[PDB]
Design a protein around this motif. Structure first.
Motif, PDB file in Angstrom:
ATOM      1  N   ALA A 179      -1.343  -5.616   8.782  1.00  0.00           N
ATOM      2  CA  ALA A 179      -0.279  -4.635   7.983  1.00  0.00           C
ATOM      3  C   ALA A 179       0.481  -3.861   8.820  1.00  0.00           C
ATOM      4  CB  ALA A 179      -1.315  -3.470   7.410  1.00  0.00           C
ATOM      5  N   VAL A 196       0.680  -1.278   0.018  1.00  0.00           N
ATOM      6  CA  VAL A 196       0.023   0.200  -0.195  1.00  0.00           C
ATOM      7  C   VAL A 196       0.960   1.231  -0.030  1.00  0.00           C
ATOM      8  CG1 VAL A 196      -0.229   0.002   2.478  1.00  0.00           C
ATOM      9  CG2 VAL A 196      -2.187   1.391   1.030  1.00  0.00           C
ATOM     10  N   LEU A 223      -6.738   7.263   9.947  1.00  0.00           N
ATOM     11  CA  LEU A 223      -6.169   6.578   8.623  1.00  0.00           C
ATOM     12  C   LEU A 223      -6.378   5.178   8.481  1.00  0.00           C
ATOM     13  CD1 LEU A 223      -2.484   8.378   8.940  1.00  0.00           C
ATOM     14  CD2 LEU A 223      -4.471   9.208   7.659  1.00  0.00           C
ATOM     15  N   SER A 224      -6.326   4.520   9.947  1.00  0.00           N
ATOM     16  CA  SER A 224      -6.626   3.043  10.102  1.00  0.00           C
ATOM     17  C   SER A 224      -7.505   2.222   9.100  1.00  0.00           C
ATOM     18  CB  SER A 224      -6.897   2.500  11.479  1.00  0.00           C
ATOM     19  OG  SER A 224      -7.713   3.068  12.209  1.00  0.00           O
ATOM     20  N   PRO A 225      -8.810   2.949   8.840  1.00  0.00           N
ATOM     21  CA  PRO A 225      -9.674   2.118   8.244  1.00  0.00           C
ATOM     22  C   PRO A 225      -9.550   2.265   6.727  1.00  0.00           C
ATOM     23  CG  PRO A 225     -10.887   4.000   9.661  1.00  0.00           C
ATOM     24  CD  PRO A 225      -9.469   4.019   9.424  1.00  0.00           C
ATOM     25  N   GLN A 226      -8.452   3.131   6.338  1.00  0.00           N
ATOM     26  CA  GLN A 226      -8.083   3.262   4.804  1.00  0.00           C
ATOM     27  C   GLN A 226      -7.018   2.346   4.497  1.00  0.00           C
ATOM     28  OE1 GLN A 226     -10.451   5.262   4.538  1.00  0.00           O
ATOM     29  NE2 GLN A 226     -10.205   6.551   6.557  1.00  0.00           N
ATOM     30  N   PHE A 227      -6.433   1.561   5.452  1.00  0.00           N
ATOM     31  CA  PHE A 227      -5.418   0.493   5.246  1.00  0.00           C
ATOM     32  C   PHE A 227      -5.981  -0.827   5.494  1.00  0.00           C
ATOM     33  CE2 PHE A 227      -2.064   3.418   4.608  1.00  0.00           C
ATOM     34  CZ  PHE A 227      -1.964   4.239   5.857  1.00  0.00           C
TER      35      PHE A 227
END
Lengths: 159, 63
Positions: free
Chosen positions: B41, B13, B58-62
């Motif tokens: 991740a 990513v 940011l966490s939900p986007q990864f």
């Protein structure tokens, strides 16, 4: 990372079916204090691995609120309600961030997932998600996450 | 497709973003078991660090 959602046999796994071409998504998050996050992502499969490219724009967070002041403590369990619309798969979530002060900070999120080729869309169902920060250095320039995600029927009874 | 998506898969990513004007970049790599619904991740901020905001946005986007 939507390729990793466990699905029942009788619900089409939209994200897995989109490969190898893959899919794109766009997300909007509205936080209760006026903060907004818009995100777009492209997911593809190359050289036997998934490749993700993400762009993120966050705006209007109060310089004095829990996000800018680093005062959040993780996401609760998430239930994303899925439904097909306008040729795409949409997900809506009402979900909170834990706060250091014994409190909560709510968000409404809607995401549109679109496959790069025609893929069968599922009907309405839920994706249940647990998202955990498993470890990080002091300043979060290095962080490790764990996620578990599973689709479940939302209609259909005990059947 | 059940051929091309193996029981174990890895991913890479790249994120580029800004929050309240603060530009940043993040590079990461992960792995998991697509059919079991589980994954991990490891992400590193590569530009714009350290970040002035909650990692939780940011966490939900990864993921």
């Amino acid at each position: 990372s939507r390729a990793y959602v466990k699905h029942p046999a009788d619900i089409p796994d939209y994200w897995k079916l989109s490969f190898p071409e893959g899919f794109k998504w766009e997300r909007v998050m509205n936080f209760e204090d006026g903060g907004v996050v818009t995100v777009t992502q492209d997911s593809s499969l190359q050289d036997g691995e998934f490749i993700y490219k993400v762009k993120l724009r966050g705006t209007n967070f109060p310089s004095d609120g829990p996000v800018m002041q680093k005062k959040t403590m993780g996401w609760e369990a998430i239930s994303e309600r899925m439904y097909p619309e306008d040729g795409a798969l949409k997900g809506e979530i009402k979900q909170r961030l834990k706060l250091k002060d014994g409190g909560h900070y709510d968000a409404e999120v809607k995401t549109t997932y679109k496959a790069k080729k025609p893929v069968q869309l599922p009907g309405a169902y839920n994706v249940n998600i647990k998202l955990d920060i498993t470890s990080h250095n002091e300043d979060y320039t290095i962080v490790e996450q764990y996620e578990r995600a599973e689709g479940r029927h939302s209609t259909g009874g005990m059947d | 497709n059940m051929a091309i998506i193996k029981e174990f898969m890895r991913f890479k990513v790249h994120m580029e973003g800004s929050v309240n004007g603060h530009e940043f970049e993040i590079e990461g790599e992960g792995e998991g078991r697509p059919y079991e619904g589980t994954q991990t991740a490891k992400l590193k901020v590569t530009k714009g660090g350290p970040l002035p905001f909650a990692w939780d946005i940011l966490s939900p986007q990864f993921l």
